[PDB]
């Protein structure tokens with residue numbers, strides 16, 4: 204399936220590369236505002252709505268800083284760069300938490316495939332594959348040599364805004380301190 | 382299929398983003414940093430597609446006649462809440478009889494590394510036979526996408542080939558030079 208390939212791709216070509224070094228990059232950051240959480244928070248919107256900017260999703264999520272770049276040779280690209288961003292989460296206009304946060308990039312591929320005629324990929328296919336991506340990725344991480352990351356999958360109906368993405372991420376950050 | 386998704390992902394998440402500005406980056410490079418009259422960086426991204434899905438981390442180690450020269454000017458952008466994501470491409474010289482015989486922007490197709498890993502990991506349920514079948518389909522699907530894509534305009538060449546990276550007789554530089562010389 205489309206999702207099977209994307210989940211393996213995201214694990215092999217990204218998470219397996221950045222998660223073993225994440226704990227250390229946060230140290231180089233932390234002590235060198237506000238301790239940043241230790242885990243990479245990965246947002247999995249099942250509708251595959253992935254904006255370039257998180258503040259677009261929720262104005263209470265604001266970019267704060269970049270972690271130091273991780274660079275390395277991969278597939279003939281000398282000094283490929285992987286970068287991650289730290290965001291503050293505001294509550295009543297003030298900072299309530301900070302964490303390394305991003306959307307799962309393969310969900311942009313599912314979205315764009317649903318939009319390109321030649322991909323032969325419907326909106327129903329997109330939802331089914333977004334689900335299968337999440338499940339497949341989770342099953343991989345469950346025995347992947349999880350501790351450095353937290354996956355948050357969620358669905359939001361289209362005509363409906365009872366949803367605060369910043370509040371949900373804050374709930375998770377608070378539970379982890381515990 | 383697996384290959385369908387991986388080819389679309391390579392297009393959506395990479396080639397559609399880098400191909401529109403590639404020739405401007407190459408022109409900048411040749412105009413300002415490389416005034417060698419027979420040494421101009423070629424105008425297309427050459428993408429290596431080893432059908433056994435053997436992708437080395439270091440392209441130049443697998444041939445003494447491929448030498449890293451420099452990087453193109455970086456391309457940067459915000460994507461999926463990653464600020465200033467960087468897309469980099471490397472320029473290599475291709476040596477023949479000790480001379481610089483070609484110069485090009487060269488890299489392996491990254492999704493092939495995925496097909497290789499899937500064939501290695503039990504949990505992927507993906508055989509070596511599946512891997513060869515999907516590699517071939519990946520190549521076909523990518524060719525069909527690029528043929529219709531507005532971003533692909535004499536600026537990308539796929540180079541598919543059967544030989545293992547641990548060749549002995551096969552020369553990767555010769556394989557690339559043969560295509561460079563046909564344009």
Ligand SMILES: Nc1nc2c(ncn2[C@@H]2O[C@@H]3COP(=O)(O)O[C@@H]4[C@H](O)[C@@H](COP(=O)(O)O[C@@H]2[C@@H]3O)O[C@H]4n2cnc3c(N)ncnc32)c(=O)[nH]1
Pocket residue numbers: 209212213214215216217278280284285286308309311312387390391392393394395396463466467468469488489491492494
């Ligand atoms: N050679 C090359 N290939 C790239 C590059 N960026 C992406 N690709 C490949 O294009 C496909 C889609 O990539 P995404 O960035 O949308 O999601 C890819 C994909 O889902 C998975 C595997 O990535 P790769 O092995 O590098 O190959 C990708 C992938 O085949 O990790 C994601 N990923 C890779 N780099 C990053 C990254 N830096 N930040 C967030 N996600 C990333 C790139 O910079 N150089």
